[PDB]
Design an enzyme around this catalytic site. Structure first.
Site, PDB file in Angstrom:
ATOM      1  N   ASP B  11      15.516  56.226 -46.552  1.00  0.00           N
ATOM      2  CA  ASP B  11      15.836  55.613 -47.840  1.00  0.00           C
ATOM      3  C   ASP B  11      14.764  54.560 -48.118  1.00  0.00           C
ATOM      4  O   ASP B  11      14.811  53.424 -47.599  1.00  0.00           O
ATOM      5  CB  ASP B  11      17.256  55.037 -47.804  1.00  0.00           C
ATOM      6  CG  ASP B  11      17.702  54.430 -49.136  1.00  0.00           C
ATOM      7  OD1 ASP B  11      16.852  54.190 -50.015  1.00  0.00           O
ATOM      8  OD2 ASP B  11      18.924  54.190 -49.303  1.00  0.00           O
ATOM      9  N   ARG B  14      16.179  51.283 -50.035  1.00  0.00           N
ATOM     10  CA  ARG B  14      16.780  50.382 -49.057  1.00  0.00           C
ATOM     11  C   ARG B  14      15.729  49.707 -48.190  1.00  0.00           C
ATOM     12  O   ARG B  14      15.712  48.482 -48.056  1.00  0.00           O
ATOM     13  CB  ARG B  14      17.785  51.177 -48.198  1.00  0.00           C
ATOM     14  CG  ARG B  14      18.240  50.503 -46.931  1.00  0.00           C
ATOM     15  CD  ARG B  14      17.446  50.935 -45.676  1.00  0.00           C
ATOM     16  NE  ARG B  14      17.998  50.404 -44.436  1.00  0.00           N
ATOM     17  CZ  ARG B  14      17.419  50.534 -43.257  1.00  0.00           C
ATOM     18  NH1 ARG B  14      16.242  51.163 -43.185  1.00  0.00           N
ATOM     19  NH2 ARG B  14      18.006  50.052 -42.159  1.00  0.00           N
ATOM     20  N   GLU B  60      24.805  43.447 -32.627  1.00  0.00           N
ATOM     21  CA  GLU B  60      25.177  44.828 -32.928  1.00  0.00           C
ATOM     22  C   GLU B  60      26.351  45.248 -32.058  1.00  0.00           C
ATOM     23  O   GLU B  60      26.246  45.263 -30.829  1.00  0.00           O
ATOM     24  CB  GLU B  60      23.984  45.781 -32.771  1.00  0.00           C
ATOM     25  CG  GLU B  60      24.334  47.259 -32.834  1.00  0.00           C
ATOM     26  CD  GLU B  60      25.020  47.658 -34.128  1.00  0.00           C
ATOM     27  OE1 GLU B  60      24.712  47.026 -35.188  1.00  0.00           O
ATOM     28  OE2 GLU B  60      25.936  48.536 -34.108  1.00  0.00           O
ATOM     29  N   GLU B  89      31.811  38.242 -34.445  1.00  0.00           N
ATOM     30  CA  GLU B  89      32.934  37.315 -34.401  1.00  0.00           C
ATOM     31  C   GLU B  89      33.081  36.622 -33.045  1.00  0.00           C
ATOM     32  O   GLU B  89      33.612  35.509 -32.991  1.00  0.00           O
ATOM     33  CB  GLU B  89      34.217  38.058 -34.761  1.00  0.00           C
ATOM     34  CG  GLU B  89      34.402  38.380 -36.207  1.00  0.00           C
ATOM     35  CD  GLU B  89      33.656  39.653 -36.662  1.00  0.00           C
ATOM     36  OE1 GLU B  89      32.978  40.293 -35.831  1.00  0.00           O
ATOM     37  OE2 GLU B  89      33.775  40.001 -37.838  1.00  0.00           O
ATOM     38  N   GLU B 103      22.585  44.114 -43.470  1.00  0.00           N
ATOM     39  CA  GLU B 103      22.789  45.347 -44.225  1.00  0.00           C
ATOM     40  C   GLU B 103      24.277  45.698 -44.188  1.00  0.00           C
ATOM     41  O   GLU B 103      24.715  46.635 -43.515  1.00  0.00           O
ATOM     42  CB  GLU B 103      21.955  46.464 -43.617  1.00  0.00           C
ATOM     43  CG  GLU B 103      21.783  47.704 -44.486  1.00  0.00           C
ATOM     44  CD  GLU B 103      20.840  48.717 -43.889  1.00  0.00           C
ATOM     45  OE1 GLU B 103      20.135  48.374 -42.921  1.00  0.00           O
ATOM     46  OE2 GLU B 103      20.787  49.870 -44.377  1.00  0.00           O
ATOM     47  N   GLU B 112      34.219  50.086 -45.522  1.00  0.00           N
ATOM     48  CA  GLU B 112      34.002  49.642 -44.140  1.00  0.00           C
ATOM     49  C   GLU B 112      34.243  48.131 -43.973  1.00  0.00           C
ATOM     50  O   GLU B 112      34.374  47.640 -42.849  1.00  0.00           O
ATOM     51  CB  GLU B 112      32.662  50.071 -43.547  1.00  0.00           C
ATOM     52  CG  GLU B 112      32.348  51.586 -43.636  1.00  0.00           C
ATOM     53  CD  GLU B 112      33.246  52.478 -42.825  1.00  0.00           C
ATOM     54  OE1 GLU B 112      32.889  53.668 -42.680  1.00  0.00           O
ATOM     55  OE2 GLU B 112      34.296  52.021 -42.363  1.00  0.00           O
ATOM     56  N   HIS B 259      20.745  56.084 -50.189  1.00  0.00           N
ATOM     57  CA  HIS B 259      21.760  56.674 -49.335  1.00  0.00           C
ATOM     58  C   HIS B 259      23.168  56.226 -49.682  1.00  0.00           C
ATOM     59  O   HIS B 259      24.120  56.846 -49.191  1.00  0.00           O
ATOM     60  CB  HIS B 259      21.456  56.458 -47.852  1.00  0.00           C
ATOM     61  CG  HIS B 259      21.751  55.080 -47.353  1.00  0.00           C
ATOM     62  ND1 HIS B 259      20.894  54.029 -47.573  1.00  0.00           N
ATOM     63  CD2 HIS B 259      22.796  54.572 -46.644  1.00  0.00           C
ATOM     64  CE1 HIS B 259      21.393  52.927 -47.034  1.00  0.00           C
ATOM     65  NE2 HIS B 259      22.547  53.228 -46.463  1.00  0.00           N
TER      66      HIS B 259
HETATM   67  C1  LIG Z   1      28.775  49.520 -44.043  1.00  0.00           C
HETATM   68  O1  LIG Z   1      28.933  50.923 -44.267  1.00  0.00           O
HETATM   69  C2  LIG Z   1      27.763  51.687 -44.155  1.00  0.00           C
HETATM   70  N1  LIG Z   1      27.274  51.810 -42.774  1.00  0.00           N
HETATM   71  C3  LIG Z   1      26.251  50.973 -42.426  1.00  0.00           C
HETATM   72  C4  LIG Z   1      25.598  51.079 -41.256  1.00  0.00           C
HETATM   73  C5  LIG Z   1      24.391  50.239 -41.020  1.00  0.00           C
HETATM   74  N2  LIG Z   1      24.403  49.585 -39.677  1.00  0.00           N
HETATM   75  C6  LIG Z   1      23.031  49.217 -39.200  1.00  0.00           C
HETATM   76  C7  LIG Z   1      22.326  48.236 -40.126  1.00  0.00           C
HETATM   77  C8  LIG Z   1      20.837  48.114 -40.149  1.00  0.00           C
HETATM   78  N3  LIG Z   1      20.367  46.752 -40.458  1.00  0.00           N
HETATM   79  C9  LIG Z   1      19.927  48.915 -39.172  1.00  0.00           C
HETATM   80  O2  LIG Z   1      20.219  49.709 -38.315  1.00  0.00           O
HETATM   81  O3  LIG Z   1      18.730  48.707 -39.622  1.00  0.00           O
HETATM   82  C10 LIG Z   1      25.386  48.456 -39.665  1.00  0.00           C
HETATM   83  C11 LIG Z   1      25.822  48.144 -38.266  1.00  0.00           C
HETATM   84  O4  LIG Z   1      26.676  46.972 -38.291  1.00  0.00           O
HETATM   85  C12 LIG Z   1      27.503  47.087 -37.161  1.00  0.00           C
HETATM   86  N4  LIG Z   1      28.588  46.127 -37.305  1.00  0.00           N
HETATM   87  C13 LIG Z   1      29.611  46.156 -38.214  1.00  0.00           C
HETATM   88  N5  LIG Z   1      30.429  45.138 -38.133  1.00  0.00           N
HETATM   89  C14 LIG Z   1      29.909  44.383 -37.090  1.00  0.00           C
HETATM   90  C15 LIG Z   1      30.315  43.173 -36.508  1.00  0.00           C
HETATM   91  N6  LIG Z   1      31.411  42.504 -36.875  1.00  0.00           N
HETATM   92  N7  LIG Z   1      29.562  42.681 -35.498  1.00  0.00           N
HETATM   93  C16 LIG Z   1      28.486  43.374 -35.105  1.00  0.00           C
HETATM   94  N8  LIG Z   1      28.013  44.527 -35.581  1.00  0.00           N
HETATM   95  C17 LIG Z   1      28.772  44.981 -36.577  1.00  0.00           C
HETATM   96  C18 LIG Z   1      27.922  48.545 -37.134  1.00  0.00           C
HETATM   97  O5  LIG Z   1      28.327  48.940 -35.833  1.00  0.00           O
HETATM   98  C19 LIG Z   1      26.631  49.256 -37.580  1.00  0.00           C
HETATM   99  O6  LIG Z   1      25.897  49.833 -36.495  1.00  0.00           O
HETATM  100  C20 LIG Z   1      26.087  52.092 -40.337  1.00  0.00           C
HETATM  101  N9  LIG Z   1      25.530  52.237 -39.135  1.00  0.00           N
HETATM  102  N10 LIG Z   1      27.097  52.901 -40.670  1.00  0.00           N
HETATM  103  C21 LIG Z   1      27.696  52.808 -41.891  1.00  0.00           C
HETATM  104  O7  LIG Z   1      28.550  53.620 -42.274  1.00  0.00           O
END
Ligand SMILES: COCn1cc(CN(CC[C@@H](N)C(=O)O)C[C@H]2O[C@@H](n3cnc4c(N)ncnc43)[C@H](O)[C@@H]2O)c(N)nc1=O
Ligand SMILES: COCn1cc(CN(CC[C@@H](N)C(=O)O)C[C@H]2O[C@@H](n3cnc4c(N)ncnc43)[C@H](O)[C@@H]2O)c(N)nc1=O
Lengths: 317, 317
Positions: B11, B14, B60, B89, B103, B112, B259
């Site tokens: 993307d 993005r 992460e 958290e 992101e 989500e 995306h």
């Molecule tokens: C949102 O809806 C779409 N969406 C987005 C992502 C994007 N990614 C990665 C982001 C990005 N900056 C990279 O990989 O470059 C977001 C990541 O954020 C993580 N995450 C969520 N709540 C969290 C918390 N409280 N503490 C720590 N990590 C947390 C989650 O496990 C993902 O791996 C994904 N993977 N699936 C999805 O459906």
């Protein structure tokens, strides 16, 4: 729920092959009786009536049988095409039939295992010497270099050139996810992906004595081929054709695309090959131990001077 | 499992929006500390280090954190970007941070429910007056005539002209399947589908007092528009933009695809509209009762002189 039916009716190869395969048997169908095994929304039963069939029994186990009854009515054929709900194994027909038509092929030909129901109906309801449409099927394999897969895996190593961050370590992760599993993957390919001349590895004559037992024991055979050029080998594609007694309905990646696509057997990782690299192996299509309707494929293969390897696949959900 | 990550890095909208949104804040980031909430495979944390951040904490929760640690190492940043597994958290950071990047946007912006974790980290770890990247978000709606949906539904009524069998009764069945449900459908559209000028119906300032409670109560607002021309109205598309303190990352169907696509709210069946038909309504984005991470959208709408109607949607799986 409508989605599978949309894909079918948008498949010009499928729809026209059956329409013309049926019409080419006008002589055998004219004034005769037909059983449509798994009639779905009913188009094959209507085609049979339009080829002159006296009466067609459209047997459909799923809820969609109601739509076949409405389609029959809309075409004014309610007095010649009778839609019967439930499994063909237990339907009561009023007479034996002169021909069976069925759209029984699944992904990799045998996923969902519908052929056994066509054979059950043949034994129970087909008159001696009756017609099966289609009458036969052939299975093909070719080694593949999947161009889309190559690009997907390689894109991680191009991130540096596009955003200034090296992400090449993701390539191995992505390879494990996309190739390291043991699922059959349904995907459409083209000639750009085909690494050697396709090889026929099995032939099924639907009326032949013993076919039921062959399906249980495994259908398939050996193959050998020689690569056209240098590329990463990703595995093999399996596809099929069926013949109407002849018109051929093909699902080859070298022919126009169909909703059956091809069944892809990926090796755990890419293997470099070159012009004239010899590849040999054996492919067996089997019912899965736990679900006889889920296709299993056992692959033996030998690439060049490498040792023979094995990979045991089950159809993806 | 790799698939979501492939979609992200492919993307360009993005990836480049974040890269440049981060780079535009060089002055605020130079020599400062950053928290990346949900760092994934880590590219945003690397971008922040390349904009001059002194130190970046990449937090992460999923298994993929291991790949972020390898990406950091491959880029020679292991002494400035620290990958920390688990929920933000409960992570222990060694210091409060000058900026948060994340992101966090999902489908329909809030599916989500990740924004709440960014707000939790802001409260717990962000220094007074610190920077949030992005800083704000806007929600848009437009009435749609989905050209692909129109074609899919109408194809049943074209079967007669292509194969000589009337299948028009399938249109009502297909309409019930594709529009009669109450799921939010994620699908990309374009200007060819947009029936009126898009309307902004909500604005979220991520640093503003009270936002957490607004998310629980529902985010949204009223809208009104007037149709451009005659077409079957299928419902509405919802999308969002976010702003980096300005560079705007847009997911509008009138802008280059992303995306995130758009979130489609289909009416139970098509409604004919004409030039200047007035449409009004109200859209509320809510957490689902049973899963607070699953987006629910409550839609009130009024088409022309028709009575106001309601439809309560939940995100498709
Ligand atoms: C949102 O809806 C779409 N969406 C987005 C992502 C994007 N990614 C990665 C982001 C990005 N900056 C990279 O990989 O470059 C977001 C990541 O954020 C993580 N995450 C969520 N709540 C969290 C918390 N409280 N503490 C720590 N990590 C947390 C989650 O496990 C993902 O791996 C994904 N993977 N699936 C999805 O459906
Ligand atoms: C095979 O794998 C791909 N495949 C194929 C179909 C095609 N259709 C419809 C066929 C067609 N002639 C039309 O609709 O035009 C085959 C139909 O056959 C039905 N069926 C299967 N075993 C049955 C039995 N023992 N007795 C009665 N009906 C039976 C089954 O319920 C389907 O509705 C599908 N729907 N899904 C799929 O995944």
């Amino acid at each position: 729920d409508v989605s599978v039916h949309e894909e079918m009716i948008a498949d010009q190869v499928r729809t026209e092959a059956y329409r013309l395969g049926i019409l080419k048997n006008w002589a055998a169908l004219r004034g005769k009786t037909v059983l449509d095994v798994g009639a779905g929304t009913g188009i094959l039963s209507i085609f049979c009536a339009q080829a002159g069939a006296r009466r067609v029994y459209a047997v459909e186990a799923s809820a969609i049988w109601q739509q076949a009854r409405e389609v029959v009515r809309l075409n004014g054929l309610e007095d010649r095409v009778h839609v019967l709900p439930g499994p063909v194994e237990t339907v009561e027909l009023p007479e034996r039939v002169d021909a069976i038509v069925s759209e029984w092929m699944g992904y990799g030909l045998l996923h969902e295992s519908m052929l056994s129901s066509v054979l059950h109906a043949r034994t129970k309801w087909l008159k001696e010497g009756g017609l099966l449409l289609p009458a036969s099927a052939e299975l093909f394999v070719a080694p593949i270099s999947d161009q889309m897969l190559e690009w997907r895996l390689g894109f991680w190593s191009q991130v540096k050139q596009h955003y200034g961050v090296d992400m090449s370590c993701m390539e191995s992760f992505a390879t494990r996810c996309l190739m390291g599993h043991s699922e059959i993957v349904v995907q459409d390919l083209s000639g750009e992906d085909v690494l050697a001349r396709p090889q026929r590895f099995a032939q099924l004559e639907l009326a032949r004595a013993g076919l039921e037992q062959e399906l249980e024991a495994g259908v398939g055979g050996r193959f050998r081929c020689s690569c056209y050029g240098s590329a990463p080998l990703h595995g093999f594609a399996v596809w099929f054709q069926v013949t109407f007694p002849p018109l051929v309905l093909s699902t080859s990646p070298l022919h126009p695309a169909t909703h059956w696509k091809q069944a892809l057997l990926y090796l755990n990782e890419p293997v470099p090959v070159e012009q004239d690299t010899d590849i040999s192996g054996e492919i067996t299509l089997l019912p899965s131990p736990d679900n006889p309707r889920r296709l299993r494929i056992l692959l033996r293969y030998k690439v060049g001077d490498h040792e023979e390897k094995t990979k045991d696949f089950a159809m993806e959900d």
